[PDB]
Amino acid sequence: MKDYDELLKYYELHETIAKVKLACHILTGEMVAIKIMDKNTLGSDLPRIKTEIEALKNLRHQHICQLYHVLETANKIFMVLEYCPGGELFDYIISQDRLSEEETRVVFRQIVSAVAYVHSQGYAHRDLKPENLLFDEYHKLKLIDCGSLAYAAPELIQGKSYLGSEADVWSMGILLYVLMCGFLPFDDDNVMALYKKIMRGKYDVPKWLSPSSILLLQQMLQVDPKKRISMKNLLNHPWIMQDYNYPVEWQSKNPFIHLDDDCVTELSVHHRNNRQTMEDLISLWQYDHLTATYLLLLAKKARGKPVRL
Numbered sequence: 001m002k003d004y005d006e007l008l009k010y011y012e013l014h015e016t017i018a019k020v021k022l023a024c025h026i027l028t029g030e031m032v033a034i035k036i037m038d039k040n041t042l043g044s045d046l047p048r049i050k051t052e053i054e055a056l057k058n059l060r061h062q063h064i065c066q067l068y069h070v071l072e073t074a075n076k077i078f079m080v081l082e083y084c085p086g087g088e089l090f091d092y093i094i095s096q097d098r099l100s101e102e103e104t105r106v107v108f109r110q111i112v113s114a115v116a117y118v119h120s121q122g123y124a125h126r127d128l129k130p131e132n133l134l135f136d137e138y139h140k141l142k143l144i145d146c147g148s149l150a151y152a153a154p155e156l157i158q159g160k161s162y163l164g165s166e167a168d169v170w171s172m173g174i175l176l177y178v179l180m181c182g183f184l185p186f187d188d189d190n191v192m193a194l195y196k197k198i199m200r201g202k203y204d205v206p207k208w209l210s211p212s213s214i215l216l217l218q219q220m221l222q223v224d225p226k227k228r229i230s231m232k233n234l235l236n237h238p239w240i241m242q243d244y245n246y247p248v249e250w251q252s253k254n255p256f257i258h259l260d261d262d263c264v265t266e267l268s269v270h271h272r273n274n275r276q277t278m279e280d281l282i283s284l285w286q287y288d289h290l291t292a293t294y295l296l297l298l299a300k301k302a303r304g305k306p307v308r309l
């Protein structure tokens, strides 16, 4: 099939993980996750996923899975994203039963950092849940992307026009609960009973939760989105500040503007161009093979692997 022609110039496909395949970037040897979307099946949804790809092009952060490459053919769209070998967050919560308040704080501060940055760029995620949070090789969290009902804010369930920011805060409250308890605050075999439980907003408070844990949950989990704690307050909340003594770092460390000389130098030689020219081209950020190759060289560098293509 011709849809794979251009893609197989850049990557070797491996196992299945939209369909998602593990792949190897030929030039760097770096592993990636490739999301394969078929335009025909998407149909009426196509213009909406196009908007979402453009949102991800505007997100570069230490706690968001990097988009490396976007390729479009007659029938498909390929998104080359970061491979996260540590797995998804709920699998991790299952391995430890539940996290201590301490290890919840480590994890939760990363989640807050990513969400705050998403809101800073003018988006809301709107689908926060453990499945959308993965561990990288450094055991650091990365955010990606009836089934999501358990994490849905009361207003989101009702169909009332929502503010994404307030809905995200509620979802984080649910995540905070799951991290510290190892089960959901609102759960039922019956969908109708789950709807009523979420809109009621009453949940068991286990005996092992500190009063500061319990207060933060009450502030995040408010059925009225107007009474819900704002993101700014969350950044420097006493529970959050504990043991760190500094607010959540939400600002991106991963810049669009700054470049790495070593990676630029290696691409210059390979392209047979100068430093100024190679810098001009890379800073275009077209999310083509160049973008992919540059960002994967930067990852290869961070692991301490050789930079030679």
Ligand SMILES: C#CCN1C(=O)[C@@H](C)N(CC#C)c2nc(Nc3cc(F)c(O)c(F)c3)ncc21
Pocket (backbone or CB within 6 Å): 017, 020, 033, 035, 065, 066, 081, 082, 083, 084, 085, 086, 087, 088, 134, 143, 144, 145
């Ligand atoms: C460990 C391990 C392998 N692994 C999994 O077992 C499961 C949880 N998924 C989700 C899927 C499909 C993975 N996703 C990504 N990367 C990714 C990054 C993104 F940004 C995505 O949008 C995406 F779908 C997958 N790497 C690795 C995995």
